[PDB]
Symmetry: C3
Subunit: 303 residues, 3 copies
Amino acid sequence: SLVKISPQVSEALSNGRAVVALESTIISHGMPYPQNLQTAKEVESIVRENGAIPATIAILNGVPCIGLSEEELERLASLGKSVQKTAGRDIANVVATRGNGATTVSATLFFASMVGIQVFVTGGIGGVHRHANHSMDISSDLTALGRTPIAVISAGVASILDIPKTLEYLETQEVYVAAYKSDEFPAFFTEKSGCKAPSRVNSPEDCARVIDANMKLNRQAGILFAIPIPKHHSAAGNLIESATQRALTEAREQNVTGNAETPFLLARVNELTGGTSLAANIALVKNNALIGSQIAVALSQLM
Amino acid sequence: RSLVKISPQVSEALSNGRAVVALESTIISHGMPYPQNLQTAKEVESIVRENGAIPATIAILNGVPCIGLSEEELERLASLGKSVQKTAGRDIANVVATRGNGATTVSATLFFASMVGIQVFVTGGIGGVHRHANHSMDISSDLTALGRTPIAVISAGVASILDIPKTLEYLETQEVYVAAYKSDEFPAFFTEKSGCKAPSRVNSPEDCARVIDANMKLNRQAGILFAIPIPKHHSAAGNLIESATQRALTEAREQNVTGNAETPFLLARVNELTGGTSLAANIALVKNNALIGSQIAVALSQLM
Amino acid sequence: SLVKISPQVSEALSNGRAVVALESTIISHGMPYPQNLQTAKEVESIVRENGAIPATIAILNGVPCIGLSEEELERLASLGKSVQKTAGRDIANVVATRGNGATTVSATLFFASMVGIQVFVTGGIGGVHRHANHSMDISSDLTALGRTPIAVISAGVASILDIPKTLEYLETQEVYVAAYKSDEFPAFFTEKSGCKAPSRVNSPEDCARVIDANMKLNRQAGILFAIPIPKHHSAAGNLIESATQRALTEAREQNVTGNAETPFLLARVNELTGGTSLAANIALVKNNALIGSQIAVALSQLM
Ligand SMILES: O=c1[nH]cc([C@@H]2O[C@H](COP(=O)(O)O)[C@@H](O)[C@H]2O)c(=O)[nH]1
Ligand SMILES: O=c1[nH]cc([C@@H]2O[C@H](COP(=O)(O)O)[C@@H](O)[C@H]2O)c(=O)[nH]1
Ligand SMILES: O=P(O)(O)OC[C@H]1O[C@@H](O)[C@H](O)[C@@H]1O
Ligand SMILES: [Mn+2]
Ligand SMILES: [Mn+2]
Ligand SMILES: [Mn+2]
């Protein structure tokens, strides 16, 4: 009615075939055009190569789109950063003003769950920002996942955020958190965060069985699977931390706040590391798409 | 149903899809002194009606939740004053069970308005993150209520007695859409200037109505805060409101005024300190919220 | 469906008879076998003796059980601490791995509410941890009760936690909190917390009337009734505080974190008080079962 679902996604959902939701803010605010389009195409190709149907979610001319046509992807990507970064709380406004919106994890969660997609691949999830006891700056991603029964496939949480506090917040929100094939919770750019994972899963089939259980119980809280970036693609943790500290200070000084903050910080860290962090970001999203697609296929086979 | 009493005019309005504006009752019982509390409530209901909407003041009377009050009930409530229980959402069941009188806060009024399908709720200010919440965790259930109730709250922002930046952050985490009306600055109740940028902006009642309408069609289970800056000619910005507020906060700490006694103490003391100016501003902003809120409700009714 | 409800509980729910939910972690994590089984039997007997059907909740071989048979209670008791401490966010995982789980307050709430049980007797509820300002360590019991319309019967909150902040957090979550026949909020082992109770109820009938109103209103938030430990069983606040202070220091030095912290502290306080604290813990659970049952019976009669 209000939501436009692509034929291919619509067909897969009707037949119980694997579908993987994808967000669009990485396209609009994660990298420049046409690299953004290239990375988005590659991710969707990895999803299809591993047996799932990719469902990139966005809002175009006020219409929520679940699954984008090639034309729509190209159009969105070419708009670049002029597209509105759209969290869940922004959806109604972008719809009402007939605008274009690139959806974050919290908005993408909402639409994916709405149409019955169970697996959502992202790069990293928002979290508790550093010094949140002074700011209370905490991503709506965490509350959204706490009340949306969907599995988010991430590479953990970036060190621009407070990882230990983000893990505590997720526990309080009743989100099941598990690291993939590791006892150590990953830190996005780097495989190791310094925090033990609260739980562990060792295969795509293991992940699918937890999701299946969650669905059967009708629990209204979600799941975060954290897939460590492949060791060969992991960025040096001292280079990342040094760039991160500088970026955080610059954000504070230039009064970058609210939803402008994460995009500002990730872009600055990429500048400061001469491209190394963006390259790792691209690597982990591709790895997440691979594992995420395998989970969705396993889940489809269970059901 | 058998427990909630809906006034005939509100009942008819809901059945026919007419514009309805919910109103809370704690501003009457605990928010303002006895002549102005009743006078203001009557003036607000009149502004709502004059602009084409039906006012639905919500309260609990002798254990009965009432949605829409008669002039007599409004009179009865204003005079009972603070003998009525200040009733947050979490207190409703208790007040009903004990057959008490309760003046409903934003969190309680939200619950009842949403229950019967009212989409627009006009208030003065919303509760928020209290100052020093890092040592207390004192945070209004208004914020959590709005985060899980699909209704639009029309306020004049957040008072500086609270921590405005942290309140804005908390609302974002709860997925509440926040927009300032015809301004880039988030307003601060008595005064238009909070020092904080508005996270979003809307420029007409019709624009507000379109956001609410989209939110309803999407079936999102989170609400909206529209923050209407107090009209420039009624602002208390010129009256040392921030100084008076700071002095009031300090005096409350020294006299151990806490809990439900605090806000009334602070409001009375700030009014003393500003020679009546802060109360006048409070009256002005609630009336302005009623005007814009009614216009939003009417535009929404027309959309639907 | 997926949940196994015992015949006695099922029959009681079908007939609108009083049912009291109970958790299993004190069996699993509170004391050694076979005394642990005898205590569990004594608590269930208090429930039956006061006119209600006890519904002990646990997960056995991946199956959620609401109401345990004699054989099932024996198996749970013999597993001892080898059972997984299962919060709400752990349920899907324990189900998926076919594990045994002792459900905490947050997990037990979910299952009791699912099948229409209105009264859940516990000992104490989890809360805001001390120094939560630097850790954000806050029990999911609080968020669970804020979105589950069920009454929890507790003896308040232990002083190992931050009681004032716990009370504030509950207000924020819209949980109605009332002390039973007292103006002072109780502190688990001890009747006095130092905090005024936010509200008060003076009989099981009063409690049932609040629950009945909450049910008729269809509010989706729960209730915490805090029943002070009987005066003759109350532990002295200075022998508790001494043990408590030492236990807290030790947990900090041994870097005990996450879901291990509360079980560590309670076990250590019990060690340091030579059994006095566990004795008080058993006394308050038995008192809670008595009052809880009377409330559940009064509620059944109202309905
Ligand atoms: O490399 C990236 N990680 C994460 C984001 C986005 O940032 C959001 C968090 O932003 P905020 O907490 O302001 O809502 C996440 O949901 C995600 O969509 C992004 O654009 N690029
Ligand atoms: O003697 C006790 N044993 C176990 C608990 C459990 O601890 C939980 C809180 O721990 P956490 O916040 O870490 O989930 C409670 O739900 C309860 O089931 C308790 O409170 N008291
Ligand atoms: O959760 P509650 O207690 O209702 O919110 C805190 C503040 O919200 C307002 O209504 C009151 O003035 C109170 O001080
Ligand atoms: Mn933020
Ligand atoms: Mn408060
Ligand atoms: Mn914890």
